[PDB]
Every structure is written in structure tokens, then in C-alpha cells.
Amino acid sequence: TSSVANANAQYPIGCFHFDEAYETNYGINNVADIINKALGTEWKNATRP
Amino acid sequence: ANDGRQDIFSGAPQPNQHHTLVYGKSYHFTITNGLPEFRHLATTNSGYYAQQRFKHIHGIPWERLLMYVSEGELLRMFRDYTSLKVEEVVCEVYSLGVRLPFVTSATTSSVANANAQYPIGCFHFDEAYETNYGINNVADIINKALGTEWKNATRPTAAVTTAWSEQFPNISASSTSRDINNPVIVDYSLPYFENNVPKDVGIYDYVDIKNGTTAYGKCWEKRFKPTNGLLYAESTLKGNVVTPLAAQPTNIMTPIPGLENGYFMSNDQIRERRDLTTSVPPVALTATKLNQSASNNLNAFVDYMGYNYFGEQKCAPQSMPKFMIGFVNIRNEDNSLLNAKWDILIKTRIRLTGLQSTREWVARTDRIPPQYFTSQYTQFRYPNINETPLLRSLGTFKLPTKRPGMDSRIAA
Amino acid sequence: YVDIKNGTTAYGKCWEKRFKPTNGLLYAESTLKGNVVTPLAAQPTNIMTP
């Protein structure tokens, strides 16, 4: 029963940009996934059963 | 100039009465998280709808008159005037914090952590998609707002002293924190066999988020000055609740503006009188109070009740904005929902205007004087004045063009 | 109801008509019908607002 209840850990976050100095790339499925979740798939029965 | 031709006496009637009422209440409610859920709804007349309920977005029924006035005050103001109009309604929401447990315990859990910075916001996508509340959900919020009596106003045969008890069958939220659950539901009509459907509402395109931890105090305030705050109006000569007409229509008739075209917003489409074959379509006739039942009055809405002014276009105005507030769900590492409890305080204020048409009507009975001759109020009801008028859907529906959903409880 | 010109000397631009339609609506879609063939499936209910 874990719970992410602590928001006062002062975790460091940042904007990385070393993509301007070294070869970089993303995983094909990783990006594909982000986009499928962005669009999401339909669940409404546009066409009546 | 006083040539014995000037008036000696000049009469004039008494004025109409114009009273202004001001009421208000304060409540303490608590609401909680909830993941979104969906289903498909089938209804009579082959109705089919795609529904999406946001269990983390709750709506304050500020459209309900009982949120400002108690049942007692409502009863009185409903019998005292010829017509009663809502001038303005105000609803303030104060946040007392969004808490949750430091550690989830299946048994002795405690909402002791108020520093989780849970995102909260004011949602308003009710202006872009069909929305509605659950009938019992709203009914519940109001029962907890009013609360049921526990004092023995009428002494028991044995008026003996009883033991202290925290078990209030239903204490008002005006005396203590009380839980309420009124998830907003978004409908996606599917009237055809093959429908054109939109992508689920993007709630993040209709929200103003605040930090649940630092937002302590006044957060939101909504005001509304109804165009047609007509709660009721009497313009008929019917001096009873039981009597039916005795005379049938004659040949005497004079053309009046009317301003009622017989067009309705039947769910997703516009329909003309002749096509509403399932239920009998209302018609804008001379208004009455003796049409509404006692229970109907209790469910009075502040924006529109079916009554209109003689010179205005007989129709429903755009319903007041829904007052929806809620969380912006945070999820745990296993993607489960991070539960939280939100304590809020609500202040409600309302100003109404009562009229008593006593100028052209000197009554010799307690019967309220009707706005009969000089002008007449009108309401959507049926030629049979005793038939239930066009009622307001308790589910607080928002139909296309942003108008309040209404029922025609008269079967055809 | 006529404005006459000399057919021989009137060589060039003669008339120009302009029109800004009040209702130039060629078409508009406001229904949920997502097909050209499908008919309604649901009949009118008791839900109706003026």
C-alpha cells in the first residue's frame, strides 16, 4: 500500500538541452505511445449496436 | 385660471405592492477524488447516449432556490405575492485545505497531511458540451443543506430528559462539515444509427487550477442576475386549486402578440409542436400559481421556471453557468488514484422582488390579487389549467444553445 | 424601368452590380447525423425546452 503523499521533497527538476552537442534520439514505440495517449482511442458507440 | 371650470377632485387608485426579500446561508461541505468513468445509456423512445462521469469534478447546485432559502422561508414567499422574481444570486466558495494520509492504513487511516499541494480548480466546460447532475446527488446536497429537524417542537407525552448523542439523523451542513457527492456527467447524444461523435471533452481546456495547499480561504465567487428570475406569477381568475373551467371558449377573441412559435429544443435537435408526439407540447398561456404542487415549489430553480413576461419572447433563457469545482487527480506510482479530501465553506446570498397587484384589484379575501387586466404573465402549461405545467428537469440539463432541460410530464 | 445608352458609342464598361447578401448561407451543419443514409433511431422524448 504505497502512497505518493509527500510533495515537500524539493526534488530537482530541469530542462536538459545537450541534444545540441551529442547525437540523440527517442525510442520509436516510446514516442508512438505518448501520441496514442495524447489522441486516445474512441469508446463511444458512434454507430449504434 | 380658476374660471370655475377647473377640477375640484381628482381620484387615483392605491399602488401595487413591491417588496424586496434578502436571504442567505452558509455551509460546510467535504468532497473527494474520483477516477473518470463511462457507460452508455438507453432510454424510452429509443434514446441512446454516451455518458462520461467525472467523479472528481463536483457541482454546487446554486441553481436550486433551496440553497439560499430554507423550506420554511420558501413556503411563505411562495404564498405572499402575485409574482416573485429573483434579482440576483451569489455563491462564494472558501477552501479549508485539501488533505490526505501520510501513510495509507486499511484500518486506522488519518487525513493528517495538508501539504500535498493537490491541484484544485474551477471547471467550466459546461459551456461547450451537454452536462447534467444526478437527480439523487443534487437531492442529497440539498437535504444536507437544509437538514431534518431533531428538536421535539411538539412535546412527547413523557417529556423526559434524554441522553446526549452525536447520531444526528440528518444535521444541517450549516452546523457541521457534511460529505456531498455530485459528479458532473457529460452526455454525447447518439440519436441516429450512425452518429457524428467528438473526442472526449478536454477538461484541461476549461479549468483554472490553484494550489490546494496554499489556496486557503476565498477561492471563487459566482454572481448571476437572471433575465427571467420568475419563480411564479398569478394572472388567472381561478380562485381555487381544484376548480376547473366552467365556460368553453366563445367567439370573442382579439389577436395578441403571443411571441411563441411552437419550437422546442428536443434534446439534440429543434422540433416543432406537431412533431413532439410522445409527450404533449406546452403552450404559453396566462400564468397561475395554482398549477405547481407543494413539492414542485420546493424544487424551484432560480434562472427559469417556465413563466414569462407578456411582452417578451416566450421561451427559456440560457441557463446560468454550472458552478463546478474539483480536483486534478494525482496518481500513485502504480497509476492508482491518490485519494484526497477537500473541505470547503459555501456562502449563498439571494435578492428577490415580490409584487402584489393591488392597484386595479381590491380583494376582500385572503386570495392573492392576480395581475389580470392591465397586463398578464404567461407560463408554459396546457389548455387544461389543472394539468401539471412544463416542469424543470431536476437533473439540471444543459441542452444545445445552453438552455435548461425541461420535462413535459403529460403523456400523449 | 430602363437606362438607355448608345449602342455604337458605348464601348467598354457599361454596368456593374454588387450584392452583399444578408443571408448568404449556402449551407450549414448542426446535426449529429454522421452519415447521408442513416435515419433517426430515437423518437422524440418528454425532454424539451422552449
* Strands laid side by side in the B378-381 sheet: B283-286, B378-381, B307-308
SS3 state of residue B12? coil
List chains adjacent to chain B, taking adjacency as at least 3 C-beta pairs closer than 8 Å: A, C
Radius of gyration of chain C (CA): 25
Residue linked to cell 437606362: C3
Could you say which of C32, C37, C50 has the minimum Cβ distance to residue B195? C32
Query: Quick check: is B252 in a domain?
Result: yes
In angstroms, the Cα distances linking B271 to B77, C20, C44 are 36, 31, 9
- C46 vs B408: CB contact, 8 Å cut-off? yes
Return the C-alpha cell found at C5. Answer: 445608352
Cα separation, B24 vs B28, whole angstroms = 14
Q: Which amino acid is at A16?
A: F
Give the helix/strand (H/E) hosting B327.
strand B323-327
Query: Quick check: is B5 in a domain?
Result: no
Residue B121's nearest CA partner among B41, B200, B40, B31 is B31
**Which of B190, B205, B268 to mutate against chain A (most A CBs within 10 Å)?**
B190
Cα separation, B407 vs B280, whole angstroms = 10
- B46 vs C43: CB contact, 8 Å cut-off? yes
Percent composition of chain C: helix, strand, coil (DSSP 3-state, to 5): 0, 10, 90
Largest CA distance in chain C: 72
Return the C-alpha cell found at B151. Answer: 428538536
- A3 vs B332: CB contact, 8 Å cut-off? yes
Cα separation, B347 vs B325, whole angstroms = 15
Cα separation, B49 vs B185, whole angstroms = 11
Return the C-alpha cell found at B126. Answer: 459546461
The 10 Å CB-count burial string (b at 16+, else e) for B301-337 is bbbbbbbbbbeeebbbbebbbbbbbbbbbbeeeeeee
In angstroms, the Cα distances linking C35 to A42, B163, B270 are 18, 69, 19
Cα separation, B86 vs B225, whole angstroms = 8
Q: Which amino acid is at B198?
A: P
Query: Quick check: is B7 in a domain?
Result: no
SS3 state of residue B382? coil
Cα separation, B269 vs C30, whole angstroms = 9
Query: Quick check: is B320 in a domain?
Result: yes
Q: Let me know: does B169 contact A22? Beta carbons within 8 Å.
A: no
Residue linked to cell 464598361: C13
Q: Which amino acid is at B306?
A: G
Residue B315's nearest CA partner among A37, C48, C44 is C48
CA distance B379 to chain C (A): 11
Could you say which of B50, B101, B106 has the minimum Cβ distance to residue A5? B101
Query: Quick check: is B105 in a domain?
Result: yes
> Å resolution of this model?
3.1
- C50 vs B316: CB contact, 8 Å cut-off? yes
B167-171 contacts: CB < 8 A, separation 24 or more?
Answer: B170/B143, B170/B144, B171/B147
Give the helix/strand (H/E) hosting B184.
strand B183-189
- Burial-class residue B391 by CB neighbours within 10 Å (0-12, 13-18, 19+): buried
Size of interface B-C (CB pairs under 8 A): 109
- A42 vs B197: CB contact, 8 Å cut-off? yes
Q: Which domain holds residue B379?
A: 14-412
Q: Which residue of A has its CA nearest to B115?
A: A7
Cα separation, B9 vs B69, whole angstroms = 47
Residue B183's nearest CA partner among B126, B127, B144, B133 is B133
Query: Quick check: is B363 in a domain?
Result: yes
Tell me phi and psi for residue B309, to 5 degrees: -85, 150
Structure determined via: X-ray
Query: Quick check: is B4 in a domain?
Result: no
- Burial-class residue B105 by CB neighbours within 10 Å (0-12, 13-18, 19+): exposed
Cα separation, B409 vs B280, whole angstroms = 8
Residue B231's nearest CA partner among B307, B120, B141 is B307
Q: Let me know: does B361 contact B369? Beta carbons within 8 Å.
A: yes
The total number of residues written for chain B in this structure: 412
Cα separation, B85 vs B355, whole angstroms = 9
Domain count of chain B? 1
Return the C-alpha cell found at B284. Answer: 404559453
A17-21 contacts: CB < 8 A, separation 24 or more?
Answer: none
Cα separation, B291 vs B111, whole angstroms = 49
Cα separation, B411 vs C22, whole angstroms = 42
Cα separation, B47 vs B187, whole angstroms = 12
- C43 vs B48: CB contact, 8 Å cut-off? no
Size of interface A-B (CB pairs under 8 A): 64
The total number of residues written for chain C in this structure: 50
Non-local CB neighbours of B322 within 8 Å, separated by 6+ positions: B59, B63, B124, B126, B131, B184, B396, B398
Non-local CB neighbours of B329 within 8 Å, separated by 6+ positions: B33, B35, B56, B337, B338
Residue B83's nearest CA partner among B245, B295, B320, B306 is B306
Query: Quick check: is B9 in a domain?
Result: no
SS3 state of residue B188? strand
